Design a binder for this molecule. Structure first.
Ligand SMILES: C[C@H](NC(=O)c1c[nH]c2ncc(C3CC3)nc12)C(C)(C)O
Length: 281
């Protein structure tokens, strides 16, 4: 339905945690016989003002999003409150990449890259900045299909502005953040592009822990945030993943253009990745 009765949503396990919200695997079981469909249900675990309004927004946003490459909204449910979503058993991409490594050539990484870019293109066209783009936040619909998830921090851009300024600090691993976010808490469709660069790096390192974004800044060597800012200002960048084809490194480096306005758009990126995907073969 679009509306789920809480009494029929039946609990199975934890799938994830996030700022003040959990997502759970539930069976939606109106018969009560274990034959009902599986669903991923997000609730907030804190009942204050701003986190509750933010959650409502996230629902408004995801409801109004229709794309093969965006996680699918199924409905809400009420108490007097919960967000119900399609469930993707293969789960997290970060993990999926680590497991199936030996089964995935460059085409497929490019295939995923294209699909994520396409979803981000669309997100951008709805004026939606995602703000927390990263392999851990991408779900796997199948071996040849991925989808962007976790709208917990997404913002709508007012009609008259192309950027958002966040008051408090971020709480995500620092290594996916654009410089303007690090220094000024400025997020935009173009800071999303910065992070998409890092997602590509993740695809092509197959999310390996030993050469992760974090592991690399560490190697590349005062507050962490400040040092990462100095580096990125000096023009230090993540290196070509091992075996990475060069053309892809260049796209990354381009996504990492110092100023937001030199970064290419998702709609520029999409064809290039497409050409690359039909290039390997
Ligand atoms: C925890 C959160 N997940 C969701 O919102 C999910 C929505 N549908 C899913 N299907 C499988 C999984 C399995 C991967 C848990 N997660 C989710 C996220 C991965 C986006 O941070």
């Amino acid at each position: 339905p679009t509306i789920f009765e809480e009494r029929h949503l039946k609990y199975i396990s934890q799938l994830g945690k996030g700022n003040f919200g959990s997502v759970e695997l539930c069976r939606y079981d109106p018969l009560g016989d274990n034959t009902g469909a599986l669903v991923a249900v997000k609730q907030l675990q804190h009942s204050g003002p701003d986190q509750q309004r933010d959650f409502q927004r996230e629902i408004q946003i995801l409801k109004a999003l229709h794309s093969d490459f965006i996680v699918k909204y199924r409905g809400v449910s009420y108490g007097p409150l919960r967000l119900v979503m399609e469930y993707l058993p293969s789960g997290c991409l970060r993990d999926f990449l680590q497991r199936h490594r030996a089964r995935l050539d460059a085409s497929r990484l490019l295939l995923y890259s294209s699909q994520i870019c396409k979803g981000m293109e669309y997100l951008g066209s709805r004026r939606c900045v995602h703000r927390d783009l990263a392999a851990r936040n991408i779900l796997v619909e199948s071996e040849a299909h991925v989808k962007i998830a976790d709208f917990g921090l997404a913002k709508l851009l007012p009609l008259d502005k192309d950027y958002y300024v966040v008051r408090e600090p971020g709480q995500s691993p620092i290594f996916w953040y654009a410089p303007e976010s690090l220094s000024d808490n400025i997020f935009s469709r173009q800071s999303d592009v910065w992070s998409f660069g890092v997602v590509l790096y993740e695809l092509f390192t197959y999310c390996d822990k030993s050469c992760s974004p974090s592991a690399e800044f560490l190697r590349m060597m005062v507050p962490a945030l400040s040092r990462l800012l100095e580096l990125l200002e000096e023009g230090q960048r993540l290196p070509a993943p091992p075996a990475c084809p060069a053309e892809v490194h260049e796209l990354m480096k381009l996504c990492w253009a110092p100023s937001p306005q030199d970064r290419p758009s998702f709609s520029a990126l999409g064809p290039q990745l497409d050409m690359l995907w039909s290039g390997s073969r």
